[PDB]
Design a protein around this nucleic acid. Structure first.
Ligand code: MG
Ligand code: MG
Ligand code: MG
Ligand code: MG
Ligand code: MG
Ligand code: MG
Ligand code: MG
Ligand code: MG
Ligand code: MG
Ligand code: MG
Lengths: 139, 55, 125, 179
RNA sequence: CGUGCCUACCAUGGUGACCACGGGUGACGGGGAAUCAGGGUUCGAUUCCGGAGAGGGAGCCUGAGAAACGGCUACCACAUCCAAGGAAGGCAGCAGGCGCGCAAAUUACCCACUCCCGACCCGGGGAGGUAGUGACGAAAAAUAACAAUACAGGACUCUUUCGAGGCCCUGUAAUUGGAAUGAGUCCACUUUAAAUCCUUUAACGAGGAUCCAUUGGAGGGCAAGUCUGGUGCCAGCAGCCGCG
């Protein structure tokens, strides 16, 4: 059972504060190492400069080669294989560009075809790959 | 390691088709007017087990 | 030909004017001007339009009524005293001609620089 | 710092399950019956019927001789009479609970326009209240989402508009061809 | 002014597992906001009240009121001008500009309203008010209708009906008015400190080149194709299962 007496509300506080760290979610949300180890500095999007193009392998039931870009963030200085999203559009991304990047779906995981990619290209010099793919605005 | 070569093999080998003219569509009140008039007030001369809005 | 009633009425003994709420029924035309409704009030109380003032007119969404506040003064200087300098001017009783900022405000600094008869230069020009 | 106002209400409901066949049945029969624009105003009326049943259930949580119940329970019921959702008989808080969505779709402007004649196949009745051609009492009404009360209820008299008054904005553009 | 507030003398105390002390803070605190069973969970710099600070940190004149910074002095860090001997500095006020970033509005008009100051019915006020930008949002809301007539996709109560309809939509790229109704061009009024916008009002302004609705998708989850043509573990799509 519990400590159900009338004056035990310190004991329940001290116990409930002690068990909440074993959740995965509260420990990443409220320990400092999640804020100061990751890229993006605790933001949502980030502009970054292309170091090079990198084409990574794939996992086994979906055999392919995925086409990605290594990125030097202006903010952080870190290195990131951001997935080039669309169907062509390896072409529309080049060397030394403004490359807005963001995550795929959840910051603690990846999408299940790639060895390590977590990140995804948006802008090419303030021109989105939605624009570049169709609507043909400008490079 | 491997190539970044085939950047859109299929999108390069696309036989394009021009998007042909179709008359412009009602919206708002009037689209949902014919959405209702398509399938609720009028199907009842048949029964209700077959499901064919696109088949 | 226009249908006007004064609904809510006052007599301002302190300001020597009268205050009335004016419903102007427009079934037809565009809203009858500042001038002509002022002449209706000049004729309904039979006193002079150069001393009778009015302001403020909405329009309540299709035909309808427009509503404002009437003023009736006795003497023109009684009208000048208990009205603001702006509401006279739409008849032409007041003009200021120094209504600009950055000419008020440049001179507030260049008079601040000098002190004395040399300010009586820039206090002149 | 500035003072004009800062207040807002979201008279709207987003539903929870987006993809039900069973929900789209009830809402697509509801659009075509009462000739609606879109599904956000289907949800508005439910948000009112949400907002009613909050107060209807809350004043059943309270005691009988509760004067807070006696002022709030009565005045809500008088509000239902002044709209005419209810009868002028049953004045009990459970008869509030017996209500529905179709009373409110009747008391909208076009359906009481459809009950006061000159409406002619609902999708047209939306139009004659949109084009400035049906007004209630003295104040000119334009917006089709007007709840018709019972104190007006009857007085649909639109002066100087083309099926009642005349006036020549546009048939002069027909008569100039006929000169 | 009351007090270890300091100084003198004297005693040897005070707080602690009811978490003190020492850190962290992406902590200004509240009033509140979001989420909706109940109970909670997360934000709250942000108009209102209270505290703090004007680059950092110290110091004081005047005053009832300041340790004031659109006051002054000194150091440090920035930093402008110059006859090189020296003088003025301080936007986390309003705009604006650079730097910084994923990230946020123009060197506007004016004390007309709200109030405040002064010797003051009179001068002041980027506090405020108003415009320009503005899809963070929120409220109401056409988008080509709409009723006829008419081909009929033809259904319905009904009497053998293979149809009279005082009941119906539909594909009509079929005709018509209310030339409707606003969107704009645009007289005038009006609102307004002037102008602006809603509105009111004068004319003009709809038959699909027109006065134009996109966004995501269509294996399951999950509303919706085994339909074609390209693709043949390559390209790629897919938040997970997986599909090639
Ligand atoms: Mg809640
Ligand atoms: Mg609660
Ligand atoms: Mg404060
Ligand atoms: Mg201070
Ligand atoms: Mg100061
Ligand atoms: Mg300053
Ligand atoms: Mg797509
Ligand atoms: Mg498909
Ligand atoms: Mg399905
Ligand atoms: Mg998705």
């Amino acid at each position: 059972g519990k400590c159900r007496g009338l004056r035990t509300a310190r004991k329940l506080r001290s116990h409930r504060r002690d068990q909440k760290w074993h959740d995965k979610q509260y420990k990443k949300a409220h320990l400092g190492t999640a804020l100061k180890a990751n890229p993006f500095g605790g933001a949502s999007h980030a502009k970054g400069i292309v170091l090079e193009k990198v084409g990574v392998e794939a996992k086994q039931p979906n055999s392919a080669i995925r086409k990605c870009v290594r990125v030097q963030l202006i903010k952080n200085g870190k290195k990131i294989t951001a997935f080039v999203p669309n169907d062509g559009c390896l072409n529309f991304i080049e060397e030394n560009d403004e490359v807005l990047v963001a995550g795929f779906g959840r910051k603690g995981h990846a999408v299940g075809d790639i060895p390590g990619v977590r990140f995804k290209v948006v802008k090419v010099a303030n021109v989105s790959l939605l624009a570049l793919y169709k609507g043909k605005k400008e490079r | 390691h491997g190539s970044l070569a085939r950047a859109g093999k299929v999108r390069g080998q696309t036989p394009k088709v021009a998007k042909q003219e179709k008359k412009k569509k009602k919206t708002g009140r009037a689209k949902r007017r014919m959405q209702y008039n398509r399938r609720f007030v009028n199907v009842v001369p048949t029964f209700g087990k077959k499901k064919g809005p696109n088949a | 030909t226009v249908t006007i009633r004064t609904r809510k009425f006052m007599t301002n003994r302190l300001l020597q004017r009268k205050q009335m709420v004016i419903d102007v029924l427009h079934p037809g035309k565009a809203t009858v001007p500042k001038t002509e409704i002022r002449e209706k009030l000049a004729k309904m109380y039979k006193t002079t339009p150069d001393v009778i003032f009015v302001f403020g007119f909405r329009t309540h969404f299709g035909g309808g009524k427009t509503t404002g506040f009437g003023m009736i003064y006795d003497s023109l200087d009684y009208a000048k005293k208990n009205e603001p300098k702006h509401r006279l001017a739409r008849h032409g009783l007041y003009e200021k001609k120094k209504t600009s900022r950055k000419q008020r405000k440049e001179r507030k600094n260049r008079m601040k620089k000098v002190r004395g008869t040399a300010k009586a230069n820039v206090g002149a020009g | 710092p500035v003072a004009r106002s800062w207040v807002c209400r979201k008279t709207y409901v987003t539903p929870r399950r987006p993809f039900e066949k069973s929900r789209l049945d009830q809402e697509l029969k509801l659009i075509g019956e009462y000739g609606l624009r879109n599904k956000r105003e289907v949800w508005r009326v439910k948000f009112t019927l949400a907002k009613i049943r909050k107060a209807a259930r809350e004043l059943l949580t309270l005691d009988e001789k509760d004067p807070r119940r006696l002022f709030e329970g009565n005045a809500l019921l008088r509000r239902l009479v002044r709209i005419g959702v209810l009868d002028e008989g049953k004045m009990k808080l459970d008869y509030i609970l017996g209500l529905k969505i179709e009373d409110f779709l009747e008391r909208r402007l076009q359906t009481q326009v459809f009950k006061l004649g000159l409406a002619k196949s609902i999708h047209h009745a939306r139009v004659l209240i949109r084009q400035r051609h049906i007004r209630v009492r003295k104040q000119v009404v334009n917006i089709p989402s007007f709840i018709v009360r019972l104190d007006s209820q009857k007085h649909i008299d639109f002066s100087l508009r083309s099926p009642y008054g005349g006036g020549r904005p546009g048939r002069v553009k027909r008569k100039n061809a006929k000169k």
